[PDB]
Amino acid sequence: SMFSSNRQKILERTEILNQEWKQRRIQPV
Amino acid sequence: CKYSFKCVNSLKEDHNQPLFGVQFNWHSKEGDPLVFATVGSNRVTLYECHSQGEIRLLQSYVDADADENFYTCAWTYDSNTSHPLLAVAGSRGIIRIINPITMQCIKHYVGHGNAINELKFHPRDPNLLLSVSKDHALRLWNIQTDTLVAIFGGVEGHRDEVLSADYDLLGEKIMSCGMDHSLKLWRINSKRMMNAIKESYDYNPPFISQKIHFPDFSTRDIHRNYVDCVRWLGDLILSKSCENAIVCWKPGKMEDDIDKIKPSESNVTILGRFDYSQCDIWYMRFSMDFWQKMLALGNQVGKLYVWDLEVEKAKCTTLTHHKCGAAIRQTSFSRDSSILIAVCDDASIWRWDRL
Ligand SMILES: N#Cc1c2c(c3nncn3c1NCc1ccco1)CN(Cc1ccccc1)CC2
């Protein structure tokens, strides 16, 4: 489907961003 | 709707001036407290979320210019120190980089020849700041080298005030929108733009900014009036005007690939609308959670709408408190989606915790 193929792209790309966030250690405010 | 929230707290800021923007810091690591910033009038205020709905005031930045009106803020981090950073801008058209630890302005950029409506940081490169202005242009800045990388405007740029923009998830392209009713696509993964970003890094003390006069796609066929908020939803676009609906659409025909779309592409595919009511005044923004499973929008009478995006008919939760009656300008979810904060025109802040 249009929305189902679009959801898979969101899942794959947000996973990439989440892995990059996980690899970081940003100091608290 | 499967999503449920409880209103656990609210407060009104001392100054009583309207609040226009709110952003949780999605850069904070696990173990660190959840922090959000609010913007309104000449003030930027930081808050920390604690257990039992506690909203703890940290400190505020007050601009020496009593006539400054901040409309937007965006979080980043210093790639060298790992320390968080906060960019703010508004009516004066000046971009301020605030150190949130001390809430002081460390540096500023005379951004545009008019007010700034929105700031967004690139999702992969923390130094790339995008500003959108009433001067009809968008500007891309490199805050590590203090350079203006590119200006998106001119011959086929916006013909009126730019109100909003958004990078897609991997930061390869920007969709902008404004008072000219148009939505324009600007690719930043083009060989020209990737080279201009590389060059801004090579710069050391003037830098020659790229002047991008032509977008990669343009449409005036989604909305028949000003477009004041745009966000990517994967390869699809979510945008709104004053017609009490957020329209989900894509450039080209139903089957067309976003990366195969030619700049002369004449068609648009409208996939559906998220309908609501009492949100027909200008400058009302919608937001999504990090995983883009939830869509949120406040209206002019203090109702907060939340839709479940995991559909094909989308279920909607309406969040209301009898004491919340002012226009909700912007909402922000904490990174883990456990908290939703809404800010109002009457200087009130509302905390909704997910059940
Ligand atoms: N939010 C905001 C925002 C707002 C005003 C604005 N004017 N030019 C740009 N503007 C904004 N840009 C940010 C933006 C771009 C797209 C969406 O939001 C004027 N305000 C009028 C007002 C003042 C005091 C009390 C109630 C109402 C409302 C808020």
CATH code (residue B154)? 2.130.10.10
**Pairs of residues, one from chain A and one from chain B, whose beta carbons lie less than 8 Å apart:** 69
- Alpha carbon A20 to chain centroid, angstroms: 8
Residue (of B140, B172, B133, B180) closest to B156 by Cα position = B180
Residues contacting ligand 1 via CB (< 6 Å) = B 18, 20, 71, 115, 117-118, 163-164, 228-229, 283, 285, 329, 345
Q: How many angstroms separate the CA of residue B14 from the nearest CA in chain A?
A: 22
**Residues of chain B found within 8 Å of residue A7, distances taken between Cβ atoms:** 234, 310
DSSP state of B48: E
What does the alpha-carbon distance between residue B340 and residue B326 come to, in Å, rounded to a whole number? 17
What does the alpha-carbon distance between residue B319 and residue B7 come to, in Å, rounded to a whole number? 8
CB atoms within 10 A of CB B323: 10
List CB contacts of A10: < 8 A, sequence separation 6 or more: B169, B233, B234, B291, B292
What does the alpha-carbon distance between residue B70 and residue B321 come to, in Å, rounded to a whole number? 27
CB atoms within 10 A of CB B188: 24
Query: Which among B26, B58, B236 has CB closest to A6?
Result: B236
Buried/exposed code over B238-251 (b: 16+ C-beta within 10 A; e: otherwise): bbbbbeebbbbbbb
Residue (of A24, A23, A27) closest to B33 by Cα position = A27
- Alpha carbon B302 to chain centroid, angstroms: 20
Distance B5 CA to ligand 1 centre (A): 27
Query: Which among B82, B101, B169 has CB closest to A14?
Result: B169
- Helix, strand, coil percent values for chain B (each to nearest 5): 5, 45, 50
What does the alpha-carbon distance between residue B353 and residue B355 come to, in Å, rounded to a whole number? 6
Pairing of strands B339-344, B328-333: antiparallel
What does the alpha-carbon distance between residue B306 and residue B288 come to, in Å, rounded to a whole number? 9
Q: How many helices (H) and strands (E) in chain B?
A: 1, 29
Name the residue type at position B127.
N
List CB contacts of B45: < 8 A, sequence separation 6 or more: B13, B37, B38, B39, B57, B59, B60, B61
Method: X-ray
Number of compact structural domains in chain B: 1
Residue A4, H or E segment: helix A2-22
What does the alpha-carbon distance between residue A18 and residue B241 come to, in Å, rounded to a whole number? 31
User: CB of A12 within 8 Å of any CB in chain B?
Assistant: no
Distance B267 CA to ligand 1 centre (A): 32
**Which of B117, B284, B300, B329 most suits a substitution to test ligand 1, by most atoms within 8 Å of the C-beta?**
B117
> Which residues, listed in sequence order, are joined to residue B89 by a DSSP beta bridge?
B72
- For B180, the 3-state DSSP assignment is coil
Structural domain that includes position B322: 1-355
Q: List the structure tokens of B118.
A: 């929105």
